Structure formats: C-alpha cells, structure tokens
C-alpha cells in the first residue's frame, strides 16, 4: 500500500520554487478513491484518463508545493506565467494528473502568512521538471549589482501574502502532481 497519505496529508508543504518530489515505487494504490474524493477542487489528468488510472502500469513521482488559487491554471502542459516559467513546468508530452485543494484554513494567518515563496525574477525559463533553488541577485537594468541588493538589483524570490479574507484567487492551494 503506497504512502500517498504522507504526500497529501503532510502538515508542511514546500514552497513552489523548492517543490518537493517523492518517488512512489513497489506498492499498490487505489487511484479511483482519490479521483471521486470530495477533498479535491482540481483533478485534471493529461495524457491519461482519470477513469483508467487503476487499470494501467512503473514508478510514480509526486511533486508537491503551494501556490495562489489563480495560479492553479499554470500547472498544465502548455502554460505561461511566473509559476509556469520560473517555478514548475509540466511538459507538453506530460502523462499524469494535477491535483489541488483550497488550503486557506491551513496556510493563511491573521495579518498574513509570508513563509511561502515563489521565484519572481529570472534570466531564463525553466525546462520541464527543473528545480531552481539558486539565489542570485537579478540585474534588472544597465547598473551592475555586485551581489548587493538595491534598486534594479533584486533578490529572485518573493513571498506570497496569504491572508484568510483574501478572495479565492489569492488564497493558498496545495498542489500534488503525479507523473507516470
């Protein structure tokens, strides 16, 4: 029996820029129990059908992180935006499922939770399944930075602002991507 309970029920989720990966190998799992569960706001399967998930194969990958509700769209085969370009990219030939659920009750705090980070600046886009965790100051213009933070010399990581009374689009959503 697969340790999916460790992935979906972990108290702490990773920041999207430092997205967590957990490989699931010699075990059995009931993929249709998760699909019809009234716990997930999103369960989109690309390349495979969510009905025939049990009647299929290999090892599985479970990537997890937290993003804004209006960024759940970027976790798809051919998307653009700060998260899809600089944080987590799924290939066009992606075979797997993107799972998400509102975690406002868990990851928002009175006055704001700023512990969840995303990459805002980068000289280049990420390749599918690439994890970038470097912290190099970004030279936004012609003035050199010299490793010193200042105007147009920005740290690449920024904090999300998770407040409980935010609208659904600005609320935290826990994401689990299963790759096959």
């Amino acid at each position, epitope marked *: 029996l697969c340790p999916f309970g460790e992935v979906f029920n972990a108290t702490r989720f990773a920041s999207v820029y430092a997205w967590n990966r957990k490989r699931i190998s010699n075990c059995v799992a009931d993929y249709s129990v998760l699909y019809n569960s009234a716990s997930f706001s999103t369960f989109k399967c690309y390349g495979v059908s969510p009905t025939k998930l049990n009647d299929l194969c290999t090892n599985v990958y479970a990537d997890s992180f937290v993003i804004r509700g209006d960024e759940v769209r970027q976790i798809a085969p051919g998307q653009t935006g700060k998260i899809a370009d600089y944080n987590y990219k799924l290939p066009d030939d992606f075979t797997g499922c993107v799972i998400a659920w509102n975690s406002n009750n868990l990851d928002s705090k009175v006055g704001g939770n700023y512990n969840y980070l995303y990459r*805002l600046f980068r000289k280049s886009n990420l390749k599918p399944f690439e994890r970038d965790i470097s912290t190099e100051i970004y*030279q*936004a*213009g*012609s*003035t*050199p930075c010299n490793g010193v933070e200042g*105007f*147009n010399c*920005y740290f690449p990581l920024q904090s999300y602002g998770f407040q409980p009374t935010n609208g659904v689009g600005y609320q935290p959503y826990r994401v689990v991507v299963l790759s096959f």
Partner: antibody
Amino acid sequence: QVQLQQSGAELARPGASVKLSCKASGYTFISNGISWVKQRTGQGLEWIGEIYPRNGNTYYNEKFKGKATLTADKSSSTAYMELRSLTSEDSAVFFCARDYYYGSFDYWGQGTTLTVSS
Amino acid sequence: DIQMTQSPSSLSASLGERVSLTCRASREISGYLTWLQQKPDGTIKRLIYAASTLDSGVPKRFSGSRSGSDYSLTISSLESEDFADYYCLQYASYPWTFGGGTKLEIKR
C-alpha cells in the same frame, strides 16, 4: 520598432498638478526600466528618476522627491510622471528614456514641453 | 552620491581641429559612462556607452577613453555637425548623474 511616445505640449497653472505620459511600443514593457529627465531652456540634463514596471519599484533623485511620482500601467504599456504643486521653476522639457539591459539609455521619447503660467 | 564634473563648460574650436572633453567621477564608476550629444534643435543621440564602446550609427572620429577617474570624449577632426552640446552620464550607481555639459561652438 521600439518607440517611446510622449504626451503633447502642456500648459498648467501654478499650484496645479500635471500627469505626463510615455507610451512604449515595439518590446515587452515589463522587461526594461523607464526613466525621466528634466531640461530647462538653455540648461543641462537632470536625472529625475526611474520606474521598473514589472514590480512598480521607483528610485528618485533627492531634488525630485515629492515633486515627481512615477507610475506604470502594464495594461496600456504606458509610463507616467505626475508633477505636483507646479511653479514656474518646473517649466522645462521632460523626456522619458529606456534603461536597457546594458549601455544605459538606448531609446528616448520626443520630449514634452511643460509651461507653468497663469 | 556620484558627482560628474565636466570640463570645459564651453569650448570654441575650428573645423578639422582635434578636441577632448573630460568627465571626472567623484568616486569609482568602473567604466559605466555614457557620452551624449544634443543638437541645437534638442535631439539627443548616444555617442558612446561603457566609456569606450562606440554606438552603431556614430562616426569613427568619435572615441571614448579613460585615464583614472578622468573619462574623455575625443573628436579627432571636427565637422560642422559636431558643433553641439555634450553630456556625460554615469550609470554605475543609483541615482544616475549627468555631467554639467559642454557647449562646443565655432571659433572665429
């Protein structure tokens, strides 16, 4: 083609505020910083400040703090400079210019002449 | 703050003459220096960036150099179009700062 198109010649009264525009086309607005320069008739060039449109971060020359306010509009790819409590000393040509990745200012707006008079 | 001291403020010269304009930076600017030309109509054009790199569409008579904190703009042989205002600009540190300018006029 990269172009910075500034607002037309402007007349404003003393004590009044003005809002100058600098429309950018021919590249992605958030990629580069937009700066402003003041030049009074027969006088030198003065760096006013710069705005980085991607995050709205700004930096000003101390002499222009309060006097000028730079804002950006990602929707219309237009840069703005609001000039407050206008006096005859603010009558000058105002330019916008692009702070490129390297080489400082590559492109410049045509200029906007401001006249502060009653 | 970085002060760019430009000299001379005014210069009288003849066609075919060799002229040099200097900008002294009050502190280290590591060659992040631009030279601009303003024609009598107000049009600004970049001559040099990075202290010595000639911009495309700028004639070869123009060249930029650096001794220590002295940055020079040299015109090997003056032409009619060259009688104009010149300004240097440092971009090594915020706030960026201009030199006071040089008015190049015709000697007679």
